[PDB]
Each structure stands twice: as C-alpha cells, then as structure tokens.
Amino acid sequence: MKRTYQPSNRKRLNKHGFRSRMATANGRRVLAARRAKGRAKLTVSDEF
Amino acid sequence: GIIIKPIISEKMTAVTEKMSERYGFRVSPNANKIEIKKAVEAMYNVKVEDVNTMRYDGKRKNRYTKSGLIRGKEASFKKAIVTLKKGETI
Amino acid sequence: MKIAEIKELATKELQERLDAEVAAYDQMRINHAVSPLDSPAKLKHQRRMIAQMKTVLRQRELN
Amino acid sequence: SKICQITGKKAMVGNNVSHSKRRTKRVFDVNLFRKKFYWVEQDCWVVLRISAAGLRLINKIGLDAAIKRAAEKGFLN
Amino acid sequence: SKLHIKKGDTVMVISGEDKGHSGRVLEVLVKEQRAIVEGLNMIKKHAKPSAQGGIISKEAPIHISNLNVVDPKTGKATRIGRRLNENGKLVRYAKKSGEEIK
RNA sequence: UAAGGGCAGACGGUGGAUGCCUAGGCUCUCGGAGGCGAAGAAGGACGUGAUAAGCUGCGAAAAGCUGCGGGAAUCGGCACAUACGAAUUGAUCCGCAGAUAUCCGAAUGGGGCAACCCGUCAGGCCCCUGACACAUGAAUUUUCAUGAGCGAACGCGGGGAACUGAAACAUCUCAUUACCCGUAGGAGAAGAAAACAAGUGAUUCCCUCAGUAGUGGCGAGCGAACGGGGAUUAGCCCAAACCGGCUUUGAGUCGGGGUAAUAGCUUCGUAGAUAUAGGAGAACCUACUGGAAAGUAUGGCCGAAGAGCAUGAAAGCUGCGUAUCCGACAUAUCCCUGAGUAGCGCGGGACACGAAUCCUGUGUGAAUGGCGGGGCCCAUCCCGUAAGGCUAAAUACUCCCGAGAGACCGAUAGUGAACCAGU
RNA sequence: UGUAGGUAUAAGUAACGAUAAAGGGGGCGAGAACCCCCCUCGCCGAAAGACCAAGGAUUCCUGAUCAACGCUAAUCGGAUCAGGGUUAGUCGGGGCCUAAGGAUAAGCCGAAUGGCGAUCCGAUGGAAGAACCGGUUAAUAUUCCGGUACUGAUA
RNA sequence: GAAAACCCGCUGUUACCCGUACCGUAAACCGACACAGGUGGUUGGGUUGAGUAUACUAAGGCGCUCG
Ligand SMILES: [K+]
Ligand SMILES: [K+]
Ligand SMILES: [K+]
Ligand SMILES: [K+]
Ligand SMILES: [K+]
Ligand SMILES: [K+]
Ligand SMILES: [K+]
Ligand SMILES: [K+]
Ligand SMILES: [K+]
Ligand SMILES: [Mg+2]
Ligand SMILES: [Mg+2]
Ligand SMILES: [Mg+2]
Ligand SMILES: [Mg+2]
Ligand SMILES: [Mg+2]
Ligand SMILES: [Mg+2]
Ligand SMILES: [Mg+2]
Ligand SMILES: [Mg+2]
Ligand SMILES: [Mg+2]
Ligand SMILES: [Mg+2]
Ligand SMILES: [Mg+2]
Ligand SMILES: [Mg+2]
Ligand SMILES: [Mg+2]
Ligand SMILES: [Mg+2]
Ligand SMILES: [Mg+2]
Ligand SMILES: [Mg+2]
Ligand SMILES: [Mg+2]
Ligand SMILES: [Mg+2]
Ligand SMILES: [Mg+2]
Ligand SMILES: [Mg+2]
Ligand SMILES: [Mg+2]
Ligand SMILES: [Mg+2]
Ligand SMILES: [Mg+2]
Ligand SMILES: [Mg+2]
Ligand SMILES: [Mg+2]
Ligand SMILES: [Mg+2]
Ligand SMILES: [Mg+2]
Ligand SMILES: [Mg+2]
Ligand code: NA
Ligand code: NA
Ligand code: NA
Ligand code: NA
C-alpha cells in the first residue's frame, strides 16, 4: 500500500524552502510569525 | 594555519611502513589541494608530489546530563594524504 | 615578550617577529597534538602574543 | 492606479440602494480615457490619461497652464 | 566585595564546634564565602586506592562569618576596619586596640 | 482438619499526597528612553578551550586583544573535575573609550535548492590564493547625501465581514469591530471662526449637563451639543495690490529670487549639575540547653544605623550591609482680497441621526461691499469673512533600562515554560 | 460517557507476526535450544543471488558492557560507550545548453498587497574532453601500489 | 513523430571542486513496530521446455529472535 509521504529532497526544498518562503509576501509573513514565536527551526532548510 | 593535526593510526602506520614517503594530515574542510600542498611545504621544508583528500562530517554524539539526554555533533574536518618526493621524510 | 616590549618595536622588526611567531605557533600546535606537552599554557601564551602584535600593528597603521 | 493626471480623481466606494433599502457595495468609476493633445508652447504631442472634468479644466484655462498646475499639485506623476 | 580575611592571616573561630581556636588561613573560597583554617574542622575522608587509598584526615572549610582576625595585642579576635594610615593607602586595622594588621 | 477465605492490630512495600521552602511567575507605581540597518540590521549557519562541547561568551587577533580610571589577592564562565599556568613589577574583576569581527540574510557583481556555485576589471603573489571595485530606485549634478529591511504598543490613512440581537427576518444591530494593507513620531491627530448661540470667544483631555434633545420596521436599539467647573494656555506666516533688479517672449505679456504685508477692514499712493566604577561607615560578655545559639536568663553598649540577606535554630552590636557623609581620568545627557471655487441637477457617504451641516462619482456653474451660517422655504435681525499654510502644553502606549511595591501565586498553582521550553 | 497522575480487574489469560526444519559433536563462559567452529539435514535460486538510482545518515570495522532496547534467554546484536574507517586529470556529478514551468526588461493592467509581459533560470533530455592488467585492508579501491596508456591547458 | 549549445562549409610543468563508508524487492526507504503491504532501472548459470511458464539444482544467500 502506497502511503501519503513519498520523500523527495528537491520537491521539499521547492515547496517549503527558505527561498520559496522569501519569494512572496505571505511567506515572509509566515517567517515573521515563526520568528516571533521563537522556533528553533524556521524552514525545512534547517533540518539535517 | 589550515593544518590541524597529524593522523596517528594503524592505517597511517601501515602505509608509512610500506611507502615511507606518505603522511596523513587533518586540515580545515575548505582548504583545497594546492593550499594544503603549499602549507606543508611551508611547515616542513619538503617538496611535495601529490595530494589526496577526503571530507569527513562530524560524528553525532549523545551528551549525557543529570536529567536526560542531549544530541550533539563533532566538528567536520578534511583528511589529506600527502606524497613527498622520493627521498625525503617528515 | 610583553606588551611594553612589543610596543617598543620599530614596525619592521615587529612584522618580522610577527611572521616568525605565527610559524612558531603553527609548529607548536602541530607538535602538541602528536606529543601532549608538559605545559600546554605556552600555546595560550603564544596565541595571546600574536593577538597583541596584530593589535599594536593595527594601532600603528591607523594612527 | 487609474487616476486622472490633471485633477487627481480616483474611483469612489459607495452603495447600491434598492427600494427596500437593501445596501450593496459598489464603485463609482471615473469617466477616464486616454487622449492625445497638441502642446502649443513646446509644439509637441502628448498623450494624457485624463477625465472629462480634467478635459473641461484644460478647455477652460489652456493645456500648458493645466499641466503646470497639475505638476505643482503632484497629480501629473 | 573585598573580604575581612585573607590567605596568610591568623584567625580565631568564634562559633561552631571549634569555638575558641586560632589558626592560619590556608585558602579562601570566595564564591561560597568559606575558608580553610590550618588544623581546624578535621574530617575523615574514605578514598579508594588510586594515584593505596585509605582514611585520610583533612581540613573542611569554615564559613568566613565564623572567623575573626586575631588582635596582635591580646589575641582576642576583634573586628577590623579600614583606614588610610600607611601613606594614604587603605590598610586593615583592629578595632579593639587600633593597631594595624600586617 | 483449615486447602483457602473474613475481620482487627502491628510492621513493611509501592506510590508521591500533604506540610514547610524557593526569585520562577502575576499585577502595578515612579523616573527615563522610545528604535536597529548599505560604515551591512533582526534572526541564523559554521567555527573557537589542555582534555568531546550541551549551554554561555567570542569571531581565523575567535571563554578573547589595547588605553585611561577604580580596586587589592587570588584567578583561568556554568552543567558537583583534575591538570597546567597567570598574578603585589598589581592578574582576575568593575566604569568609559578603542581594535578585530568568517558565511547567510534587505543581500546589493551574476545566479541559487539560505549559510553555496560562477564571474569581469584594476593591482600583488603565483593552474591557486589574500586584499579593491562591480545592485536598484529616487533628489541631484558622472563626484555627492537619502532610501529599501526588521521591529512591542500607541497615531493616521485605504479596504472591510460574519456568527449574534431584533426571541423568525430583509431596514436596523453586531461595527465605521475582527482581519488585510500602507505609512509616522516620541508622541500622533486637531488647532486660531465664512464659530456657537439667542452673551462666549483657537485646539486637546477630565467631571457635569444626560441616558436629556433627538433618532429609530418610533421596534431592538443608538445617542449628542450649548452652558457650568477644571488641566493647560500662544499665537503666527504666505498669495495679491505696490516698489526695484534679471532672463525669455510678442513701451508691453510671462517666469525668477529681494522688498513691501495680510484682514470684522487691513493694506497700496546655561555650565555647573546629573548619570554610568567607588571610599569610609557604631556597638557583646557570662551561664544553660543543644550536633551546632543568633534561642533562654543575667549583665552592658550603639542608634541621623531596630531595612534586609547570609551565617550549623530566631542576631541592632559575626559577615555583607543599613542611617549619614565623601568621590570621576575620559564619555554621554541636561486700487488690491485664494475659480472649474461658492451654488445647482442626478446617485451615494459621513455626521447621535435610517434624507440642516460637511464630503463627492457624474453633469453644470457666479459674484468683488458681496458672500456664508443661525435644521426644509421667503423677508427682517444677529453673527462671521470660504475656496493658502504652520504651531508647544495639558492626551494615548511599553519591546527596553533603573529603582520599588502587593490583606497576589508557591511546582496539576503562578506565564505554555522555576529544570534540557517554544524544547 | 468530567481532567492529570498513580494503582487495580479481567489474568498469569490473549499473544510472542507467514507450517522453508532441524539434529549432533567441539569451543568460550558463573550461566547456552538460540553465540563461535565442524559434520549431516532442509528452503530460494528471472531469487529469498549480484548491481544502479531515490530515500536514510555512521547503522560500516574493532575493543569493552548486557542496565534499558531485542515480543524468550543471551557469552549475541542494526543495542550503550570509546577508538578507527570513505583517497580519482580518465568513475558519477557540477561547471556548458535548452523543455514544461518560473522570475523578470521595454511596456500594459490595477483601492493597497499586487497581476500580466521576450533575456535569464530551470533536467527528467543534448554536450562532456581521457586506459588498463595484476596486487593490496579489520574496514576503500577503475580512487592506494607496480606495470601499459590516453586526454586538456601552460612555458 | 523537441529545443539550444555545439560541430562543419561562410621537450617541461601540470591538471581545481563535490560524492565515494554501509542498507537499498529492505530489520537501515514509505507504512507509530526488527510490521505477511508498497518502492524506478540492470543482470539473472545447468537440465526441462515455445518460453524470463513449471519442477529440480550450481554460485550465492537463508532456516523467517520463544521453546
Ligand atoms: K594520487
Ligand atoms: K574527492
Ligand atoms: K501636529
Ligand atoms: K559595620
Ligand atoms: K557567623
Ligand atoms: K550583623
Ligand atoms: K456511558
Ligand atoms: K565483543
Ligand atoms: K535481491
Ligand atoms: Mg552510537
Ligand atoms: Mg504504610
Ligand atoms: Mg585579520
Ligand atoms: Mg589598571
Ligand atoms: Mg542578486
Ligand atoms: Mg434573530
Ligand atoms: Mg551543652
Ligand atoms: Mg534546622
Ligand atoms: Mg506549570
Ligand atoms: Mg463507556
Ligand atoms: Mg478466562
Ligand atoms: Mg495479535
Ligand atoms: Mg495461545
Ligand atoms: Mg544518498
Ligand atoms: Mg556490524
Ligand atoms: Mg531480554
Ligand atoms: Mg556495535
Ligand atoms: Mg542558459
Ligand atoms: Mg540529466
Ligand atoms: Mg565493503
Ligand atoms: Mg543562448
Ligand atoms: Mg561501496
Ligand atoms: Mg546490498
Ligand atoms: Mg519487510
Ligand atoms: Mg523478525
Ligand atoms: Mg532484461
Ligand atoms: Mg534458465
Ligand atoms: Mg518460477
Ligand atoms: Na487462611
Ligand atoms: Na551576490
Ligand atoms: Na566599605
Ligand atoms: Na541501489
């Protein structure tokens, strides 16, 4: 049975990466909210 | 000072007992072969023939405190196997 | 060497001593890893002295 | 950013009001168009996006004076 | 804050199990405000064999508020103040006799 | 006979309640300050230690470098450590001023999957390196300053719901709220009568007027102003007539800076202080109990000091302190009179007001004592002088810094977080 | 059918995850059905053998340990701690080129935030210059060593 | 029944960067599990057969972590 999560690093960074968040105004809104909450990880670019 | 420390180990001892013109250094991860070569010439006054390099990432480790557990990492480094000209040692 | 002695240099012998001390510190750093030194505080001393020399050279160049 | 370059008029927000006093949001739009004008003072042709009220002001006080007044009022740019 | 005792001074224990005993200050632990007085507050420490082990007798620190500087006139464990007698330099003097402590 | 079981007591186990405790919260008061950033921010990555770094600090000069002032014996940050060194020739530590400050990020040489890849031109080394420059938009004249991004609340502006209430619901309400977006300052906005009124005299804020006048499927609801009492108190500057100079254009029309002067009535002919380190700073013995006195009992002493915290139990006289007095090498702070105007028609909006006042999408359109207002419209009367602008104070708020407080909490409480917590 | 923590009951019960299968002799050990060596047996064999990529990220090798983890025990382990280990001019990728699509220039549209719009970016495609036989580790090999070569710049 | 780059006629000194361990029809990936599932491409000996079907079996790997 195929499950919902099928990993792909290129797709992950294209969809949720730091540059894609910075591209639009609402992505920068998301980044500002996460910084205000104080999250240790800001985007999926942080994980390794 | 890109060179950090020499490599003392069984593999290095075996290769030096075999060839005797080969020496292993641990250097900064961003130093390429030309600068590793110039640096060893400066630090030891020898002529260098060839350089082989490989990048190592740090080992992941488990720091143990009184309450629980923390996840940490060691620093990354670069290995540099150095071949001197036939006739010289370190 | 001390702060007063370093400040009592001539900005050319000081530079020559700067490169000499840098090379010496690299040699001691390489040697201490192979053989653990009896008094490793010489490394801290040499590092601080290099920082002091660069500070004095920057002071002389800027003013 | 469709604004009359001579008068500064822009679209207004108001209501459609039915007979039963139902109120629905609406826009009152400017009677805006692009027109080519002969500027006599510089002997040139200039295309202006203006309203009919701006055209009335131009026909009243001349095109050069209207352009200068609009520039001093900040409408022209 | 500067302390009322220092290493190399002779002090007297004014409170505790060693009340009324004088000794020499060996080390001062400024962070926890305790000092080691020679020969006083002995403890028996059990040590495993390492660099034969055994039962070592040693000195345990005393809180500095339980120590007073000995008067160099009668040894009565006075209080001290500070003044500028020595050419204007701040020095410690005893309050019971007025003599400086050197 | 008790295989087992029931009840009680004693003693255990498990579990972590309760009591006692805590600087970790909560709510405020007073005084400051109200931004950081292209000289590269907020926030991150990667490094950096004698011994791996999880935090902290710092940046290839990397738990750190220099000078001046303070100060006097230990110090080399923390997660229960040893070594090895530094230091009275004055370390460590504190105040002020400096040096260095990798990579990403508005990111700005071009790209990019953030912390990476690839370049050009001038030099210097020597295929490879370290050090320069190389973005874009607006004033501006290619030299120059300014801007971009982030960030608590408070301000102003552009858009703008619905659940709900009306015991259904559509006018109405919720509400010019939530939310989205743009943009300032230490405050902002407003402000000097084409005003209220039936004498007062610019704005703003507080108490009243008053749940009144009004408004409203006259339902649910909404809801002033005048006047009075206070806080604070402040008024000015242009355009034109007019007088000169210059350029341009066809004696004369413009456009420039200068003078002249703007109205309920005119005009023209401060350094000492404070702050950011510091210095001094009174006065206790004996006995008892106790593991240990600060407790008890005697007996003394200080008090411009009987706040507090620590010390082997509860201390005015043990320590740090407290009352009081003293102290800074720098560095900061203190004739003319506003025209697509007034007014008007159509459709809408804001005003307490669901059609007098004010605003305008659309179409029109004057006057130069005139004009406007006093709740439909006319006349008399009264008040004012639109179509130009600026302006402190009294008012709103707290990310932050300093000093304090509580008939506020005490670890399932109090912040989600007293600890490894936005983990 | 309230919330957190702790502890019960059902109960020493269900179950211990493909019916491909095991027996014996030695070793080490305090302790062995299960660990190591040998003999015999059985299962797969267009695989349940051998490789490339995605994805994972030290699980790889060695020495200590058997607390927790492993559906039993364990002297064993993909478990804990420490040490070690990945070597390229020729392999793969990237540096070069463009597709879908994306971001933009000149311009266009639009309360704001913004939406469009041909050069640039963008592989899953095109171009890539260029070998090998033998040895060799506990763990790497077309990468290290010895022989035979090739290919591109530069003086 | 792509495009563009590109390609045609118009004797020394050298050789830079990243990956390379290990799993990978799986106990190491996606399924909370040492889970009877899912996961693109290559190779895949002998006898039998039309066959890469089927049965047996080399090389190699296993007997599926309670008896
Ligand atoms: K080589
Ligand atoms: K390599
Ligand atoms: K203002
Ligand atoms: K005192
Ligand atoms: K005491
Ligand atoms: K006291
Ligand atoms: K129920
Ligand atoms: K072993
Ligand atoms: K297989
Ligand atoms: Mg491990
Ligand atoms: Mg009990
Ligand atoms: Mg430097
Ligand atoms: Mg000093
Ligand atoms: Mg760029
Ligand atoms: Mg209703
Ligand atoms: Mg007694
Ligand atoms: Mg007690
Ligand atoms: Mg809590
Ligand atoms: Mg039930
Ligand atoms: Mg049963
Ligand atoms: Mg089951
Ligand atoms: Mg069963
Ligand atoms: Mg991978
Ligand atoms: Mg293994
Ligand atoms: Mg077990
Ligand atoms: Mg292991
Ligand atoms: Mg291209
Ligand atoms: Mg490809
Ligand atoms: Mg292998
Ligand atoms: Mg091209
Ligand atoms: Mg391999
Ligand atoms: Mg494999
Ligand atoms: Mg499986
Ligand atoms: Mg299994
Ligand atoms: Mg095939
Ligand atoms: Mg076959
Ligand atoms: Mg078959
Ligand atoms: Na019984
Ligand atoms: Na750049
Ligand atoms: Na003092
Ligand atoms: Na594979």
Short mmCIF file of C-alpha atoms (C1' of nucleotides) in Angstrom, two decimals, chain H residues 12-66:
data_model
loop_
_atom_site.label_atom_id
_atom_site.label_comp_id
_atom_site.label_asym_id
_atom_site.label_seq_id
_atom_site.Cartn_x
_atom_site.Cartn_y
_atom_site.Cartn_z
"C1'" G H 12 58.91 20.66 -19.26
"C1'" U H 13 55.45 21.80 -15.77
"C1'" U H 14 50.81 20.26 -14.75
"C1'" A H 15 45.84 19.05 -14.00
"C1'" C H 16 40.97 22.58 -9.45
"C1'" C H 17 35.61 21.48 -6.66
"C1'" C H 18 31.77 17.81 -4.68
"C1'" G H 19 30.30 12.24 -3.96
"C1'" U H 20 32.72 7.57 -2.63
"C1'" A H 21 31.71 4.00 4.43
"C1'" C H 22 27.03 0.95 4.96
"C1'" C H 23 21.31 -0.57 3.89
"C1'" G H 24 18.85 -0.30 -0.55
"C1'" U H 25 12.18 -6.27 -3.90
"C1'" A H 26 14.82 -3.77 2.64
"C1'" A H 27 15.47 -5.34 10.35
"C1'" A H 28 18.76 0.76 7.91
"C1'" C H 29 13.40 3.82 2.47
"C1'" C H 30 7.42 4.93 2.92
"C1'" G H 31 3.82 2.27 6.47
"C1'" A H 32 3.74 4.66 15.07
"C1'" C H 33 6.81 -1.76 15.16
"C1'" A H 34 13.17 -5.77 13.85
"C1'" C H 35 5.07 -4.72 10.54
"C1'" A H 36 2.82 -11.27 5.60
"C1'" G H 37 1.97 -4.36 2.37
"C1'" G H 38 4.35 -0.50 -1.32
"C1'" U H 39 9.16 1.02 -3.91
"C1'" G H 40 12.01 3.09 -10.67
"C1'" G H 41 16.21 0.64 -13.77
"C1'" U H 42 20.13 -3.54 -14.96
"C1'" U H 43 21.89 -8.73 -14.60
"C1'" G H 44 19.84 -13.28 -13.63
"C1'" G H 45 24.20 -20.37 -14.74
"C1'" G H 46 22.60 -26.01 -15.74
"C1'" U H 47 18.69 -29.95 -17.00
"C1'" U H 48 13.34 -29.47 -18.98
"C1'" G H 49 10.69 -26.82 -22.06
"C1'" A H 50 7.75 -22.50 -27.14
"C1'" G H 51 9.05 -19.64 -23.00
"C1'" U H 52 12.13 -15.00 -18.43
"C1'" A H 53 5.92 -20.64 -17.59
"C1'" U H 54 6.87 -25.17 -14.48
"C1'" A H 55 9.84 -28.80 -11.49
"C1'" C H 56 14.79 -29.93 -9.59
"C1'" U H 57 19.62 -27.81 -8.80
"C1'" A H 58 25.09 -24.84 -9.09
"C1'" A H 59 27.31 -19.81 -7.45
"C1'" G H 60 25.48 -17.16 -3.71
"C1'" G H 61 22.12 -16.47 0.26
"C1'" C H 62 18.98 -18.33 4.03
"C1'" G H 63 16.07 -21.99 8.04
"C1'" C H 64 11.91 -16.36 8.72
"C1'" U H 65 14.55 -13.96 17.67
"C1'" C H 66 10.23 -18.16 22.13
#
